[PDB]
Design a protein around this ligand. Structure first.
Ligand SMILES: CC(=O)N[C@@H]1[C@@H](O)[C@H](O[C@@H]2O[C@H](CO)[C@@H](O[C@@H]3O[C@H](CO)[C@@H](O)[C@H](O)[C@H]3NC(C)=O)[C@H](O)[C@H]2NC(C)=O)[C@@H](CO)O[C@H]1O
Ligand SMILES: [Cl-]
Ligand SMILES: [Cl-]
Ligand code: NA
Length: 129
């Protein structure tokens, strides 16, 4: 599923991401925009053999099992394919674990490079939340 901007903002707010660990909703929408272009089915392979999955491009070396990333942890205890569902629940639950892991949202390279320090509130403007 390819979400709309406000549609995803509303879904993320419902799943508890607004101000989760201090990160306002616009941060999460910004990160999803640049990680996946709001596409739950996005995948990207990395040089180390791991693959990033779903709306928040969660990585298979640490967070999910895709059966082909040798020596990987499955810290969210889910198959990576669960992260491609039109229901973002699994991605949000796993993202909450990632952002609590110490480095905050810096774990998402696109958030670091394209969202951090910008006016992220712009990502939820006009949305009925
Ligand atoms: C969205 C996504 O999947 N992003 C991936 C990043 O999570 C990942 O960065 C590395 O993640 C691990 C796991 O969070 C980091 O290790 C943690 O480091 C902190 C302190 O630095 C420590 O408190 C945690 O215990 C430790 N986790 C452990 C030991 O399990 C690690 O620091 C992150 N970055 C680096 C450079 O190692 C990157 C890199 O694989 O991939 C993203 O896709
Ligand atoms: Cl907000
Ligand atoms: Cl933080
Ligand atoms: Na894994």
């Amino acid at each position: 599923k390819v979400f709309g901007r406000c549609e995803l903002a509303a879904a993320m707010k419902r799943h508890g991401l607004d101000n989760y660990r201090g990160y306002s909703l616009g941060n999460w929408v910004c990160a999803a925009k640049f990680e996946s272009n709001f596409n739950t089915q996005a995948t990207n392979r990395n040089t180390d053999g791991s693959t990033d999955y779903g709306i928040l491009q969660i990585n298979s070396r640490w967070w999910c099992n895709d059966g082909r990333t040798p020596g990987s942890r499955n810290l969210c205890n889910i198959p990576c394919s669960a992260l491609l569902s039109s229901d973002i629940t699994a991605s949000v639950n796993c993202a909450k674990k990632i952002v609590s892991d110490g480095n905050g949202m810096n774990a998402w390279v696109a958030w670091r490079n394209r969202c951090k320090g910008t006016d992220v509130q712009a990502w939820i403007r006009g949305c009925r939340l």
